């Protein structure tokens, strides 16, 4: 529908958003995608302004997240002074 690349500089509190989903822990019914579930006021992602709630995380750096477990994507995001996000919306 629309793919976008977004680069975030990690802040003192991390990236300032939350995610749910994955092959091990779907967030919707029979949906394994990793979705953005919250963008925190005052965090790096909100300051950037581009990330939206329910964006699908397609890739983190050069690592695709389309059929992966939750903690895999978590490790990509949490470990990393600058992180390149490819998302779908």
């Amino acid at each position: 529908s629309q793919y976008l690349d977004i680069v975030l500089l990690r802040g003192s509190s991390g990236l300032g958003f939350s995610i749910a989903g994955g092959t091990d822990n779907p967030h919707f019914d029979n949906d394994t995608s990793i979705y953005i579930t919250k963008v925190i006021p005052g965090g790096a992602a909100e300051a950037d302004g581009r990330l939206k709630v329910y964006d699908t995380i397609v890739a983190v750096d050069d690592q695709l997240m389309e059929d992966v477990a939750h903690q895999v994507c978590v490790d990509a995001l949490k470990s990393g002074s600058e992180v390149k996000l490819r998302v779908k919306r």
Partner: peptide, 8 residues
């Protein structure tokens, strides 16, 4: 339950 989530 629905509350599994991770903040990053």
């Amino acid at each position: 339950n629905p509350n599994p989530e991770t903040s990053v």
